[PDB]
Amino acid sequence: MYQTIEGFLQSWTYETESTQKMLDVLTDESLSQEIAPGHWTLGRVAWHIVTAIPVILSGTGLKFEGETKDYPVPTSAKTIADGYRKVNTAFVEALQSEWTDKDLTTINDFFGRPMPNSIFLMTLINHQNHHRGQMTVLMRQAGLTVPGVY
């Protein structure tokens, strides 16, 4: 759980700052970097993170602007990094406008299962962190300098 909105934003601020720093280092060339033959590229991993914000939060009913389709993938790393900045801002703006601490207990539907809003939010962070973990290997393999996390 998360008892409070500000408590979540202290966690969320570290996560977003860290993710944005990595996105900011990506080059257009690096986006083609692959996990393996026949597998996802770095560009797709990165756009999946961006699009995951509105997708994971959709069932909470908290409404804000943001692309939700992770295909096709942008070809410019500036679109991806800026996309993340944009949608994070719209998200955090909507949370601060519409929710107070009690809203974290409201039960909503997460793709079929009912869960409190706080679990949506826990899920957002965990998902993003898994995929950022992936990005770090691929960034290294693309010859980029990875800023640290944890």
Q: Which residues are annotated as a binding site for a divalent metal cation?
A: 48, 127, 131
Decide: 139 and 42 in contact? Cβ < 8 Å: yes
Determine phi and psi for 107, rounding to 5 degrees. Answer: -75, 125
Find tokens 């300098």 and name the residue: 145
Q: Are 146 and 140 in contact (CB under 8 A)?
A: yes
Residues belonging to the binding site are 48, 127, 131
Is the CB of residue 131 less than 8 Å from the CB of residue 18?
no
